[PDB]
Every structure is written in structure tokens, then in C-alpha cells.
Amino acid sequence: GNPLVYLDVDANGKPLGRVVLELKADVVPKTAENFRALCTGEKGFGYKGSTFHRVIPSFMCQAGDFTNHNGTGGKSIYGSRFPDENFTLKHVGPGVLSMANAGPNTNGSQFFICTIKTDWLDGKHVVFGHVIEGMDVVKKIESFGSKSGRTSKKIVITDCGQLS
Numbered sequence: 001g002n003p004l005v006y007l008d009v010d011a012n013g014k015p016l017g018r019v020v021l022e023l024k025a026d027v028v029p030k031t032a033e034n035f036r037a038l039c040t041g042e043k044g045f046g047y048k049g050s051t052f053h054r055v056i057p058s059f060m061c062q063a064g065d066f067t068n069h070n071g072t073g074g075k076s077i078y079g080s081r082f083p084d085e086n087f088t089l090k091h092v093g094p095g096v097l098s099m100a101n102a103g104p105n106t107n108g109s110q111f112f113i114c115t116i117k118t119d120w121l122d123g124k125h126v127v128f129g130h131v132i133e134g135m136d137v138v139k140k141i142e143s144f145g146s147k148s149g150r151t152s153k154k155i156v157i158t159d160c161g162q163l164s
């Protein structure tokens with residue numbers, strides 16, 4: 001079945017709790033596998049220790065730049081970028097998990113969790129999962145964002161991995 005993965009998130013060094021994500025490998029297997037392996041760290045790199053560096057209230061929480069920690073970096077398990085697998089899943093509401101990009105076919109490791117329906121991203125960002133548990137954690141993260149995306153607390157994925 002589809003993987004379940006987790007992100008354990010701190011804000012200013014104190015735990016907020018756990019976000020559990022279902023990865024829709026049934027729809028986007030290549031995109032799901034990238035995220036899964038970055039959660040386990042099994043390729044020797046991944047999300048552990050990295051940050052939510054861009055958080056915009058009433059929009060989304062973005063993370064996954066584990067190389068430069070500022071939005072310029074990250075990489076996939078396949079290489080520095082990989083294609084848009086499909087656009088079948090839509091940005092239907094809060095809790096959607098989707099790939100950040102720098103235009104078509106530039107998926108790496110950066111991703112975002114929506115806190116609203118973001119329909120204008122349909123056909124532009126690859127949706128690959130959703131929050132199973134821990135939306136309260138996502139709302140906390142969101143509350144530490146700003147219009148510019150700059151966070152007002154240091155939001156760190158302290159641990160991450162695969163549950164099933």
C-alpha cells in the first residue's frame with residue numbers, strides 16, 4: 001500500500017509534535033518514492049535536521065532545502081531535479097502535500113503543505129500526498145510565518161522516517 005511517513009517538528013527547539021503524511025505512490029510513484037527515501041535518509045541525505053524556511057499564513061508551509069536551508073537548494077534521490085510525473089491530484093484544500101519547483105520539471109526535495117485550497121497551483125505543482133494526522137502541528141507552523149515567508153521561529157524537522 002501507500003507509504004506513511006512522519007516529520008517531527010520543533011519550533012525554537014521545543015517539539016510541536018508529529019505530522020504524518022500519506023504518499024500517493026498509487027498515483028505518483030516516482031514522486032512518492034523520492035519523498036519517502038528523503039524521510040528515511042536511506043540514500044545518505046534527506047530531511048532530518050532541515051527546516052521549514054518559507055511559511056505564509058493562509059497559504060502553505062514550505063520545507064525540504066536540506067542543502068542550503070534557504071530555498072535555493074535540495075536535491076532528489078534521482079539527481080538534482082526530476083520531471084513532473086503528472087498533475088492528477090489537485091490542490092483541494094488544507095493538508096495537501098505538493099512539490100515546490102522553479103518551473104516545469106524542476107522537482108528536487110522542496111515541498112509544501114497547504115493550509116487552504118490553492119487551486120491556481122493545479123497543473124503547475126505535483127501533488128503527491130496529504131496530512132493523515134498532525135494538522136494541529138501544521139497550523140502551529142503556519143502561525144510562525146509571515147507575508148514574506150520569513151519565519152518568526154526556527155522550525156526544524158528534528159526526526160523523520162517511514163511508518164509503513
Ligand SMILES: CCN1Cc2cc(NC(=O)c3cnc4cc(=O)[nH]n4c3C)ccc2NCCC1=O
Pocket residue numbers: 054070071072073074080081100101102106107108109110148149
Ligand atoms: C533553485 C535551484 N533548484 C532548487 C529548487 C528551488 C525551489 N525554490 C522554491 O520553490 C522557493 C524556495 N524558497 C522560497 C522563498 C521564497 O520567498 N520563495 N521561494 C521559492 C519560490 C524549488 C524547487 C527546487 N528544486 C529543483 C532544483 C532547482 O533547480
